Design a binder for this molecule. Structure first.
Ligand code: HEM
Ligand SMILES: *[C@@H]1O[C@H](CO)[C@@H](O[C@@H]2O[C@H](CO)[C@@H](O[C@@H]3O[C@H](CO)[C@@H](O)[C@H](O)[C@@H]3O)[C@H](O)[C@H]2NC(C)=O)[C@H](O)[C@H]1NC(C)=O
Ligand SMILES: *[C@@H]1O[C@H](CO)[C@@H](O[C@@H]2O[C@H](CO)[C@@H](O)[C@H](O)[C@H]2NC(C)=O)[C@H](O)[C@H]1NC(C)=O
Ligand SMILES: *[C@H]1O[C@H](CO)[C@@H](O)[C@H](O)[C@@H]1O[C@H]1O[C@H](CO)[C@@H](O)[C@H](O)[C@@H]1O
Ligand SMILES: *[C@@H]1O[C@H](CO)[C@@H](O)[C@H](O)[C@H]1NC(C)=O
Ligand SMILES: *[C@H]1O[C@H](CO)[C@@H](O)[C@H](O)[C@@H]1O
Ligand SMILES: *[C@H]1O[C@H](CO)[C@@H](O)[C@H](O)[C@@H]1O
Ligand SMILES: *[C@H]1O[C@H](CO)[C@@H](O)[C@H](O)[C@@H]1O
Ligand SMILES: *[C@H]1O[C@H](CO)[C@@H](O)[C@H](O)[C@@H]1O
Ligand SMILES: *[C@H]1O[C@H](CO)[C@@H](O)[C@H](O)[C@@H]1O
Ligand SMILES: *[C@H]1O[C@H](CO)[C@@H](O)[C@H](O)[C@@H]1O
Ligand SMILES: *[C@H]1O[C@H](CO)[C@@H](O)[C@H](O)[C@@H]1O
Ligand SMILES: *[C@H]1O[C@H](CO)[C@@H](O)[C@H](O)[C@@H]1O
Ligand SMILES: *[C@H]1O[C@H](CO)[C@@H](O)[C@H](O)[C@@H]1O
Ligand SMILES: [Br-]
Ligand SMILES: [Br-]
Ligand SMILES: [Br-]
Ligand SMILES: [Mn+2]
Length: 299
């Protein structure tokens, strides 16, 4: 928000306004990076981004500690080198390259389509990067009529997304990615679980309105009473939440799940790509921004 607004106070004492991305700005497949860029906490153009820029932006503006993004930073820079063909040093070339498929970006996202979702021909690909309202509605439908949801509900949401994606993706494309997705499941609990409930750390419940505002608007739900978690969330919370999601008993089983979907997931580790492997072409779509309604500087 505008710095003088005080909307972030006393959790964020140095806010900057929301500014929609323009057609030449680079955006990510990540709702967090996109919100940061929209506020200029990382470059508004989404280009030339250092590790420390990311660390400070997450810590000071989202209540997300450095530990939470240590592996994400490693993976971002691995993917930058893979996509561009050269070491990116400590200047991430842009955010858009993070949507390189079957890499850091993965299938069965909560709010993005898959790279070969619903394509008629094998060489086709689509926008697997920008927020997609219909896809996100398939996630939200699992918790329809509710204000909050728990680990078991999140497990059901990701299973629904895996089912749909395995059915809809071009044959042979779908590749399950429980380790990365469920770090992201943990990120959702870390950012938008309801810290106003007494037992949030033992038993976090996502506020659906906060989640929907963050994802749809790629800005922060201050108007709904959200603020950055304080103290900042640490990695322990995120991987515990990830494990709890996958450990939760499944009471409704969609059809068409890949083998081993129900059960624990592997620990996330650094990505690596063969030097001979050429990257898949990135989707070239202009960055998404919310239009129904458009957002003002304080939204
Ligand atoms: C350097 C830091 C980060 C990098 C490089 C990064 C990168 C990415 C990438 C590549 C994806 C796409 C995965 C896919 O859905 O196919 C993604 C998704 C996601 N990210 Fe980030 N991320 C970072 C930090 C965070 C943090 C700290 C949060 C929240 C606390 C966050 C929340 C999410 C969520 C919830 C998704 C899933 C979106 C969906 O499934 O629709 N990310 N991120
Ligand atoms: C974010 O950075 C990535 C990585 O640099 C950009 O993707 C790459 O964009 C370049 C154009 O600047 C593409 O190069 C072109 O490739 C075609 C086919 O190989 C070639 O015939 C052209 O002469 C040109 O070299 C490159 O393909 C593309 N990389 C991938 C994997 O798709 C991306 O455009 C940047 N996005 C933003 C919004 O800044
Ligand atoms: C996206 O952000 C807009 C702007 O903040 C949201 O619309 C406003 O919501 C706030 C509460 O968050 C209300 O006080 C305003 O009356 C709303 N204004 C307008 C112009 O509608 C919108 O709800 C957000 N989208 C989602 C899905 O959360
Ligand atoms: C991205 O741009 C490519 C051309 O550079 C197209 O071949 C791709 O289909 C893709 O097009 C989409 O996004 C561009 C902006 O980059 C729009 O101009 C297109 O209409 C389309 O939405
Ligand atoms: C915001 O400023 C107030 C008033 O000085 C201070 O008490 C509080 O600790 C500050 N918050 C942060 C995150 O520094
Ligand atoms: C989440 O999982 C990690 C291991 O991946 C632990 O280090 C952490 O304490 C939490 O259990
Ligand atoms: C790891 O931490 C999470 C988040 O605090 C808990 O919900 C979980 O039960 C485990 O203790
Ligand atoms: C990972 O951690 C979660 C949260 O403690 C457990 O529920 C799960 O069984 C696994 O150990
Ligand atoms: C069985 O229970 C889980 C959560 O406990 C739900 O998410 C599911 O919809 C079914 O009711
Ligand atoms: C229980 O929930 C699962 C996952 O959302 C559905 O696929 C199933 O049809 C039932 O509603
Ligand atoms: C749906 O079905 C699967 C196996 O058929 C179970 O693992 C799950 O708990 C749910 O009953
Ligand atoms: C979230 O984190 C847990 C614990 O490391 C994994 O088991 C899961 O697959 C996901 O990466
Ligand atoms: C990471 O691992 C891959 C193997 O999958 C190698 O190709 C790469 O060079 C790096 O060692
Ligand atoms: C977002 O931008 C639109 C332009 O379409 C305005 O009409 C709206 O009031 C908001 O500022
Ligand atoms: Br660029
Ligand atoms: Br489809
Ligand atoms: Br796994
Ligand atoms: Mn994806």
């Amino acid at each position: 928000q505008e710095p003088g607004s005080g909307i972030g106070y006393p959790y964020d004492n140095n806010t900057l306004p929301y500014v929609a991305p323009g057609p030449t700005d680079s955006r990510a497949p990540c709702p967090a990076l996109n919100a940061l860029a929209n506020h200029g906490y990382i470059p508004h153009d989404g280009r030339a981004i250092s590790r420390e820029t990311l660390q400070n932006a997450f810590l000071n503006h989202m209540g997300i500690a450095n530990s939470v993004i240590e592996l994400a930073l490693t993976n971002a820079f691995v993917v930058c080198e893979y996509v561009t063909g050269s070491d990116c040093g400590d200047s991430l070339v842009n955010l858009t390259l993070l949507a390189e498929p079957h890499a850091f970006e993965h299938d069965h996202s909560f709010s993005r389509k898959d790279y070969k979702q619903g394509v008629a021909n094998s060489n086709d690909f689509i926008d697997n990067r920008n927020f997609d309202a219909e896809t996100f509605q398939t996630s939200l439908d699992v918790v329809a009529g509710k204000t909050h949801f728990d680990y078991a509900d999140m497990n059901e949401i990701r299973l629904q997304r895996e089912s749909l994606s395995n059915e809809l993706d071009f044959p042979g494309w779908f590749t399950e990615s429980k380790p990365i997705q469920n770090v992201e499941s943990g990120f959702i609990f870390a950012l938008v679980s309801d810290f106003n409930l007494p037992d949030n750390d033992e038993n976090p419940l996502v506020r659906i309105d906060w989640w929907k505002y963050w994802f749809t608007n790629e800005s922060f739900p201050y108007h709904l009473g959200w603020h950055p978690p304080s103290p900042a969330r640490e990695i322990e919370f995120v991987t515990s939440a990830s494990s709890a999601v996958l450990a939760a008993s499944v009471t409704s089983t969609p059809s068409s799940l890949p083998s081993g979907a129900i059960g624990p997931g592997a620990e996330a580790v650094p990505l690596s790509f063969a030097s001979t492997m050429t990257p898949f072409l990135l989707a070239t779509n202009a960055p998404y921004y919310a239009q129904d309604p458009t957002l003002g500087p304080n939204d």
